Amino acid sequence: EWSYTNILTGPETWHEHYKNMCSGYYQSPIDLKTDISTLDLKLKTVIIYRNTSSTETTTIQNNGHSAEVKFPRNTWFISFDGILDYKYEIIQMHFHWGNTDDRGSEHTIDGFRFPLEGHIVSFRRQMYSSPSEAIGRPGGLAVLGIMHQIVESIKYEQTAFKAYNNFSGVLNSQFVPPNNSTIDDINLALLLSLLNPSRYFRYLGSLTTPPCTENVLWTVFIDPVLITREQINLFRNLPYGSNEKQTRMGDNFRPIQLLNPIDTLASRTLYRATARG
Amino acid sequence: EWSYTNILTGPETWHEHYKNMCSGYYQSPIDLKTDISTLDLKLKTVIIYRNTSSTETTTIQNNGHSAEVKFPRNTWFISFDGILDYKYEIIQMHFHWGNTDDRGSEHTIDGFRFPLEGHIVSFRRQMYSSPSEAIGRPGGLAVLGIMHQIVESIKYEQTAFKAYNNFSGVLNSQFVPPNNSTIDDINLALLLSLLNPSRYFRYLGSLTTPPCTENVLWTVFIDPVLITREQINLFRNLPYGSNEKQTRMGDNFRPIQLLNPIDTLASRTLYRATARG
Ligand SMILES: NS(=O)(=O)c1ccc(CCNC(=O)Nc2ccc(I)cc2)cc1
Ligand SMILES: NS(=O)(=O)c1ccc(CCNC(=O)Nc2ccc(I)cc2)cc1
Numbered sequence: 001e002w003s004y005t006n007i008l009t010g011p012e013t014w015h016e017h018y019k020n021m022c023s024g025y026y027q028s029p030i031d032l033k034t035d036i037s038t039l040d041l042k043l044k045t046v047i048i049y050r051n052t053s054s055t056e057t058t059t060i061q062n063n064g065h066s067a068e069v070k071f072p073r074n075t076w077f078i079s080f081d082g083i084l085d086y087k088y089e090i091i092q093m094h095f096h097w098g099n100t101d102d103r104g105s106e107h108t109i110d111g112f113r114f115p116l117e118g119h120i121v122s123f124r125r126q127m128y129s130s131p132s133e134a135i136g137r138p139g140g141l142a143v144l145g146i147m148h149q150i151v152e153s154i155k156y157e158q159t160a161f162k163a164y165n166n167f168s169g170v171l172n173s174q175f176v177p178p179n180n181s182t183i184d185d186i187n188l189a190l191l192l193s194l195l196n197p198s199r200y201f202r203y204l205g206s207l208t209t210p211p212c213t214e215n216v217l218w219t220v221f222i223d224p225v226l227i228t229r230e231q232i233n234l235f236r237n238l239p240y241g242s243n244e245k246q247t248r249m250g251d252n253f254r255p256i257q258l259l260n261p262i263d264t265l266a267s268r269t270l271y272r273a274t275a276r277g
Numbered sequence: 278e279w280s281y282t283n284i285l286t287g288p289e290t291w292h293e294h295y296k297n298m299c300s301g302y303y304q305s306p307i308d309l310k311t312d313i314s315t316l317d318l319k320l321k322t323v324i325i326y327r328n329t330s331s332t333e334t335t336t337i338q339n340n341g342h343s344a345e346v347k348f349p350r351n352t353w354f355i356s357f358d359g360i361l362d363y364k365y366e367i368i369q370m371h372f373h374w375g376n377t378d379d380r381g382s383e384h385t386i387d388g389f390r391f392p393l394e395g396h397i398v399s400f401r402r403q404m405y406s407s408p409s410e411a412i413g414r415p416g417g418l419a420v421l422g423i424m425h426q427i428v429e430s431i432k433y434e435q436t437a438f439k440a441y442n443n444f445s446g447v448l449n450s451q452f453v454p455p456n457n458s459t460i461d462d463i464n465l466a467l468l469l470s471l472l473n474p475s476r477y478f479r480y481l482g483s484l485t486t487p488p489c490t491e492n493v494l495w496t497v498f499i500d501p502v503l504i505t506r507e508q509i510n511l512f513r514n515l516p517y518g519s520n521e522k523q524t525r526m527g528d529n530f531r532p533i534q535l536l537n538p539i540d541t542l543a544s545r546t547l548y549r550a551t552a553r554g
């Protein structure tokens with residue numbers, strides 16, 4: 001029993017209902033403050049790349065709290081080091097948005113909320129042979145945060161929804177929890193090409209939904225990808241699960257967490273990356 | 278004499294008034310066509326970098342056709358090959374925009390116009406000792422095209438105007454031609470980090486104003502940087518020169534040229550770059 005909008009099970013109760021680890025002091029999301037962060041020139045461009053000979057289908061689910069794309073095993077990867085050796089394997093991508101265009105993102109950048117934040121979830125295949133082995137273990141996960149911003153004038157083909165192949169038109173009011181649907185594959189390499197993959201915040205944090213496990217290497221790109229008002233409204237037609245008070249899915253984001261709450265026993269640092277320039 | 282808006286001296290006449298080289302078959306701008314272009318994986322990330330020992334001031338001028346930033350010598354460089362060895366030295370940056378938000382750019386991407394296109398102009402210092410030696414000679418110049426798009430919700434610090442330092446407030450009704458003003462330096466490395474510097478069109482073309490010299494290596498970034506309506510209307514406050522029919526500066530773009538007019542003696546190819554995938 002957790003929710004976003006039911007005050008009985010809502011984000012204010014997670015620290016009490018899931019003490020391991022929603023009561024911790026390495027929580028996400030955080031305010032990404034450009035002025036307090038440390039520039040680390042050794043942090044390299046992110047690459048996302050696909051196994052050519054992967055064949056299996058991708059699905060999307062209304063899980064009752066978000067829209068979640070489920071990727072097949074052994075097909076999408078992240079490299080942080082310029083080597084294409086399958087250190088990080090993408091599992092899923094899901095979305096957080098607002099009831100209105102001025103909020104939705106989990107992370108903020110200098111206090112600014114975006115209308116939509118996508119989370120590309122990977123496990124550290126370098127160490128862990130399966131996602132179920134990685135999800136609960138130290139240093140198991142690496143998530144990429146993709147900010148989206150609304151523009152009035154754009155060609156479909158230059159929007160993030162082109163990389164998503166419009167979720168194969170699956171997003172509507174009848175896409176009810178816990179239904180899944182097979183979809184055309186997401187071109188995650190095209191998605192990343194829509195922003196500057198050298199320019200990001202980096203820190204150690206947590207899952208943003210219970211149990212808020214403190215095993216996430218976070219990368220949040222500073223430059224947003226672009227969508228239209230019509231595209232954001234496609235997410236807002238989804239219905240929330242029945243444990244929610246609100247009917248239409250929206251405001252599915254966790255409140256901002258401090259980088260270093262007062263009970264921390266070892267402070268964390270927010271880092272930032274920029275291009276060899 | 279030439280203009281944009283006086284039908285006597287406007288772009289339809291340049292081929293007759295400046296046949297060297299506005300009558301050529303390697304003219305710019307062009308429609309940048311994603312489908313028709315050749316992906317060339319050898320084309321690398323663009324880097325812009327500064328001589329940190331440079332002290333000289335930058336100025337901006339209303340030249341009667343555009344707002345033109347004049348950089349000091351030996352200060353800003355482009356590398357296309359990852360070596361920081363001063364092959365390309367930046368001379369100036371100017372802008373093309375529309376009377377309205379749905380046009381202004383010189384290049385189109387699959388037929389789409391942006392409200393504002395910036396042109397970072399450099400000379401091939403690898404071969405030519407000065408801008409005045411390169412500007413009229415073969416292979417002398419390389420220009421970077423930066424598309425700008427209007428968003429409603431954004432912090433000043435994530436807009437292109439942060440890189441421009443608002444041009445020190447010089448964009449207003451009283452900035453009459455041919456006035457020049459000292460401005461804060463433009464952070465061109467920050468500007469380039471606002472988009473994906475690996476994702477671009479590449480072709481051989483021309484200056485877009487008389488005498489349309491065919492000595493320009495063009496790079497046009499596909500992802501736009503972001504601005505506000507308030508920021509685009511600052512450009513629209515500039516007065517046109519007395520050679521123009523319109524009073525306020527706007528629609529200062531050249532019409533689209535063909536990649537290969539029917540009279541070409543040697544076809545050119547449109548290339549496209551994307552990140553080491
Ligand atoms: N919002 S967020 O990015 O901080 C975030 C919150 C919660 C989660 C939970 C992990 N879920 C998951 O991927 N489990 C899964 C389980 C078994 C298999 I085998 C494959 C997948 C992930 C990310
Ligand atoms: N629209 S466009 O990008 O195709 C374009 C059109 C026309 C030109 C003009 C060439 N002159 C010049 O660079 N200015 C200048 C300033 C200071 C010095 I020292 C030397 C020369 C450049 C670019």
Ligand SMILES: [Zn+2]
Pocket residue numbers: 094095096119208
């Ligand atoms: Zn998430």
Ligand SMILES: [Zn+2]
Pocket residue numbers: 371372373396485
């Ligand atoms: Zn120009």
